[PDB]
Design a protein around this ligand. Structure first.
Ligand SMILES: O=C(NC1CCN(CC(F)(F)F)CC1)c1ccc(-c2cccc(F)c2)nc1
Ligand SMILES: O=C(NC1CCN(CC(F)(F)F)CC1)c1ccc(-c2cccc(F)c2)nc1
Ligand SMILES: N[C@H](CCC(=O)N[C@@H](CS)C(=O)NCC(=O)O)C(=O)O
Ligand SMILES: N[C@H](CCC(=O)N[C@@H](CS)C(=O)NCC(=O)O)C(=O)O
Ligand SMILES: [Mg+2]
Lengths: 198, 198
């Protein structure tokens, strides 16, 4: 199909889709919009949010809904139905926490207090639970890489921007980040993608 | 399978699981904990949040991950993979909104004013987008009921608690609520369930 991804010029909520396309070697148009044209383009979107994915004229929304759609019947999905549940659950746990950050907060002092509270109180508990969940296993779920592993690498890359010491006591989680980054198609994407803060 | 659902004594995030069990006529234990039992139970859970579903003693978490698991290969999932994407997307749009409410905010009136702002300034916009998306059709996705319609009905029930006029400009969304509520297995659960505020 002819795939057109629309999002801002940042990794953000589109990046999981971008990793999946890369990993599956699927051609798409990676459309990045100007904040210039955002207020205007906003009115054309189904629920006023991005990313959207256009597939032969049809519009899809919600990044994780799109991610799951693209990974169905692929080796990134989860091998059993129970495994697919665990993939979904880990993804939503990650996404719940990333959504707690007030990314569009205008008041800077309020923003900085909230980011710091989340990073110094809530983040370490989540890192602890993920690490224990992972155990000595090579990937988060099952025998092989799933898109939950991609999403771990994606979310923690952004977290590491604001809290560089986040994983000091979690070498097994650092090892997983490096495993995802070592996948040839992912490594290729990471070297070629636009370099943005977020 | 042996199913044990653990949550608080409220509809809340467990209710979507309870509708699915009701619709599929699945026996389960509806385990409702009190706050006093929570600290001990919490310390035993991999990610420390509820609802959880124990499937033959194996703990699953994340309400929507569990919901999708239970609807896999059923007539609630969406017929095609594209329909499944649309179901997933509408579910996350609804969940995104509900998760914006600071339910466990310690300071009152940062909570009460965030509630009023979300309900007054944001909820109408979402209802409009939902109505537009429904587009005069019978159900949110395709030609038959999906668990997206259940979740619409569940989320709107809770929103109506705080904003009785939520759907006064949207009679087609009221009609959809009533249609879900008239499904016999759902009607039966709604008349029999514990009556709680939330
Ligand atoms: O910076 C962020 N969002 C801004 C908000 C203001 N604007 C929008 C406006 F206001 F211009 F429309 C530009 C975009 C942002 C948001 C989410 C995540 C994210 C989410 C999930 C996983 C994850 F890893 C990262 N990362 C960055
Ligand atoms: O308020 C909430 N939960 C807390 C937990 C402790 N207690 C339970 C106690 F203590 F009362 F048992 C009450 C306060 C609450 C949380 C989520 C949702 C919700 C989320 C998504 C969709 C949706 F429809 C509803 N709704 C209510
Ligand atoms: N559930 C999220 C929601 C997407 C979302 O809220 N995206 C933000 C950008 S990261 C957005 O479109 N905000 C701009 C606005 O609200 O005007 C998803 O993964 O798709
Ligand atoms: N993404 C949510 C997360 C669940 C969640 O945060 N649940 C709340 C109750 S509604 C909870 O466990 N609160 C108790 C606590 O955090 O200690 C889901 O649907 O499962
Ligand atoms: Mg979510």
């Amino acid at each position: 199909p002819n795939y057109k991804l629309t999002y801002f010029n940042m990794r953000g909520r589109a990046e999981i889709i971008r990793y999946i396309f890369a990993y599956l070697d699927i051609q798409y148009e990676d459309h990045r919009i100007e904040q210039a044209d955002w207020p205007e383009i906003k009115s054309t979107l189904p629920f006023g949010k991005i990313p959207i994915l256009e597939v032969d004229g049809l519009t899809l929304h919600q990044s994780l809904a799109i991610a799951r759609y693209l990974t169905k019947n692929t080796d990134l999905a989860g091998n059993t139905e129970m495994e697919q549940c665990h993939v979904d659950a880990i993804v939503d746990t990650l996404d719940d926490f990333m959504s707690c950050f007030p990314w569009a907060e205008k008041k800077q002092d309020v923003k900085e207090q909230m980011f710091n509270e989340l990073l110094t109180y809530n983040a370490p508990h989540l890192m602890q639970d993920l690490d224990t969940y992972l155990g000595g296993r090579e990937w988060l779920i099952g025998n092989s890489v799933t898109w939950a592993d991609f999403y771990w690498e994606i979310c923690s890359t952004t977290l590491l921007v604001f809290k560089p010491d986040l994983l000091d006591n979690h070498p097994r989680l650092v090892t997983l980040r490096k495993k995802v980054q070592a996948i040839p198609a992912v490594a290729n994407w990471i070297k070629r993608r636009p370099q943005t803060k977020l």
